[PDB]
Amino acid sequence: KQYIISEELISEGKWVKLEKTTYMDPTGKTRTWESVKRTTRKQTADGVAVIPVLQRTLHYECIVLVKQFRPPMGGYCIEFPAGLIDDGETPEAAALRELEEETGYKGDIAECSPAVCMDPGLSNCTIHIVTVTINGDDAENARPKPKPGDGEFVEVISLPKNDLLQRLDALVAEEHLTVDARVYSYALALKHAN
Amino acid sequence: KQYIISEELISEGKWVKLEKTTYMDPTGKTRTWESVKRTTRKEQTADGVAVIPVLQRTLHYECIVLVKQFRPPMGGYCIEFPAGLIDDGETPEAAALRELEEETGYKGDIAECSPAVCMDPGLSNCTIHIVTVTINGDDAENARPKPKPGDGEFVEVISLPKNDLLQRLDALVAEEHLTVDARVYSYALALKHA
Numbered sequence: 226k227q228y229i230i231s232e233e234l235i236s237e238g239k240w241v242k243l244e245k246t247t248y249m250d251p252t253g254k255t256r257t258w259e260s261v262k263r264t265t266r267k268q269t270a271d272g273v274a275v276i277p278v279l280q281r282t283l284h285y286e287c288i289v290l291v292k293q294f295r296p297p298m299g300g301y302c303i304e305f306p307a308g309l310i311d312d313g314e315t316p317e318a319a320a321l322r323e324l325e326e327e328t329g330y331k332g333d334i335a336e337c338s339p340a341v342c343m344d345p346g347l348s349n350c351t352i353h354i355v356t357v358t359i360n361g362d363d364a365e366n367a368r369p370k371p372k373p374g375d376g377e378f379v380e381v382i383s384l385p386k387n388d389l390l391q392r393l394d395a396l397v398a399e400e401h402l403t404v405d406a407r408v409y410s411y412a413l414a415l416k417h418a419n
Numbered sequence: 420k421q422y423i424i425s426e427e428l429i430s431e432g433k434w435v436k437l438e439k440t441t442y443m444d445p446t447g448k449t450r451t452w453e454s455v456k457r458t459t460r461k462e463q464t465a466d467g468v469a470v471i472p473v474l475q476r477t478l479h480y481e482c483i484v485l486v487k488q489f490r491p492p493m494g495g496y497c498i499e500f501p502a503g504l505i506d507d508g509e510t511p512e513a514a515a516l517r518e519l520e521e522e523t524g525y526k527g528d529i530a531e532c533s534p535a536v537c538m539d540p541g542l543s544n545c546t547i548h549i550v551t552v553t554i555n556g557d558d559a560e561n562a563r564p565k566p567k568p569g570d571g572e573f574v575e576v577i578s579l580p581k582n583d584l585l586q587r588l589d590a591l592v593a594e595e596h597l598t599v600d601a602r603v604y605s606y607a608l609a610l611k612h613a
């Protein structure tokens with residue numbers, strides 16, 4: 226009963242554009258919305274985010290996250306490993322590649338979500354969330370080598386899955402970092418389960 | 420090591436603006452980024468709230484209360500946690516309880532409130548507080564919950580059992596064209612992984 230009539234380009238950059246979307250409201254009245262989109266989608270979705278479960282025997286299971294400066298935020302964020310999917314790449318392949326590049330870890334796909342929206346009131350951006358296990362006992366993961374691409378600068382922070390929310394709160398409290406909403410949502414549900 | 424040097428307006432809408440951000444990289448080299456921001460943030464500790472609403476009812480499994488809405492940036496229907504922007508002067512907790520009531524009819528009780536978390540930090544400065552709220556579904560105030568949609572709001576309520584959340588979302592996305600929100604999907608994933 227609601228649907229897009231048209232979009233008016235407001236401003237296009239190299240990586241992001243602003244549109245004015247005209248849409249039919251469910252009363253039959255026509256309305257406008259200021260919407261953001263990337264210019265980079267070609268693609269099941271814009272990006273992948275990797276939930277990476279690091280499994281070492283006789284250790285707590287950890288979730289591997291990354292810390293980076295994020296120029297939109299003017300600060301450092303803690304996030305799942307993630308990046309945009311290349312033209313021609315499957316989400317799974319993007320997932321394993323971004324993981325290795327951002328963490329050095331070599332991972333196995335467990336499951337892959339449908340495209341899920343990042344901030345649907347504002348943008349059209351979507352990602353596939355990709356759950357990956359990391360056999361931390363395997364020789365290839367002994368000395369994980371992060372491969373930063375041009376201008377990427379990423380730190381690895383592995384936290385125990387069993388205390389995840391508490392540990393993220395501590396980092397925020399002590400280190401003035403911003404935790405990602407999806408990382409937080411996952412850390413919350415780990416506590417809320419049962 | 421990395422900090423913002425300058426922020427230059429590119430295009431300012433009524434709701435959304437695009438900036439050219441200049442930052443210092445960790446090799447000491449200057450770089451730029453195209454950054455999205457809202458025009459609506461003043462002294463609020465974040466732009467918005469999202470509510471994790473746990474519906475509780477004697478001899479019922481706990482449900483997670485979700486909402487389905489047309490999202491003009493997505494050109495489609497999305498399933499999300501109840502959410503809205505924080506009014507000027509409003510606390511995140513007040514915003515959460517208000518938005519929960521407006522979008523679902525339910526009167527909740529605050530359980531916990533996250534720090535400001537980042538929505539899509541490689542793209543925007545948008546932040547929310549994630550507020551967990553319990554709903555006493557045995558109270559008569561929550562018997563026949565009536566959504567109070569604002570001007571241009573038209574929200575459908577969808578309550579799903581916590582203990583089957585991921586499969587029930589999968590089953591909804593197999594029945595019609597519609598996107599599940601990344602924070603919801605992340606939360607439903609963690610409920611499986613725990």
Ligand SMILES: CN(C[C@H]1CCOC1)c1ncncc1Cl
Nearest residue numbers: 257258259260346347434435571
């Ligand atoms: C945040 N708002 C305004 C309020 C009005 C009631 O619902 C949202 C936007 N409105 C149009 N285009 C973009 C945005 Cl971000």
Ligand SMILES: CN(C[C@H]1CCOC1)c1ncncc1Cl
Nearest residue numbers: 240241265451452453454541542
């Ligand atoms: C998509 N990119 C660059 C790629 C290169 C490696 O990280 C993401 C952007 N570059 C500047 N401003 C905004 C965006 Cl979104």
Ligand SMILES: [Cl-]
Nearest residue numbers: 278335356612
């Ligand atoms: Cl797992």
Ligand SMILES: [Mg+2]
Nearest residue numbers: 306307308327
């Ligand atoms: Mg990345």
Ligand SMILES: [Mg+2]
Nearest residue numbers: 308323326327
């Ligand atoms: Mg990368």
Ligand SMILES: [Mg+2]
Nearest residue numbers: 501502503522
């Ligand atoms: Mg809302």
Ligand SMILES: [Mg+2]
Nearest residue numbers: 502503518521
């Ligand atoms: Mg609202």
